[PDB]
Structure 1
Amino acid sequence: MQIFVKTLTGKTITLEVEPSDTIENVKAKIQDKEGIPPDQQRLIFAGKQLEDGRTLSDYNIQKESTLHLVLRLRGCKXX
């Protein structure tokens, strides 16, 4: 099925996915298209942040559904 991933940068990414795919898969696909490493990706749907490991069907994500992408990297150089 088809779903959309939107950012507030004015970008919409179209993806072809299966209801059984995990949020991880989705991030991997996004990496292919946009070059953003999955660890740097946060996906939001229906007021919830989506967890790597759960499936699109778990979250009731269906065709034409729109997930929202936001980027998150905390500084890790130091100690």
Structure 2
Amino acid sequence: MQVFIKNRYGWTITLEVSPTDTVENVKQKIQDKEGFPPDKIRLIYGGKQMEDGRTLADYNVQKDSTILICIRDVDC
């Protein structure tokens, strides 16, 4: 049920999330893991930016799947 979060530089972390978790909750978990304000995080999966109100099951976030993260005003 864990997933991987990768930036554009290849640096990855492992986040244990739930299929019924909203992307805002995933960003809050990211903030808990690494210090990163949730309002300045873009999550990309399948080429589409993740919405802050949609759950992970809607994007088909399978187990051991990679999500690109890019911080606003940092590199994207």
- Does the TM-score normalized on the shorter chain lie above 0.5? yes
Q: What's 2:24 paired with?
A: 24
Alignment deviations for residues 18-75 of structure 1 (CA, whole Å, 9 cap, x no partner): 10000001100110111100001000000100000100000011101100000114xx
What is the one-letter code of the residue matched to 2:50?
A: L
Q: TM-score, normalised by structure 1?
A: 0.87
In structure 2, C-alpha distance between the alignment counterparts of 1:30 and 1:17, rounded to whole Å: 10
Query: RMSD between aligned alpha carbons?
Result: 0.9
In structure 1, C-alpha distance between the alignment counterparts of 2:30 and 2:13, rounded to whole Å: 8
Provide the aligned length of Structure 1 versus Structure 2. Answer: 73
Q: What's 2:60 paired with?
A: 60
Q: Does 1:40 align with 2:40?
A: yes
Misfit runs of 4+, over 2 Å: none
Gaps of 5+ in 2: none
Gaps of 5+ in 1: 74-79
Identity of aligned residues (%): 66
What is the one-letter code of the residue matched to 1:56?
A: L
What is the one-letter code of the residue matched to 1:29?
A: K
Task: Give 1 or 2 for the bigger CA radius of gyration.
Answer: 1
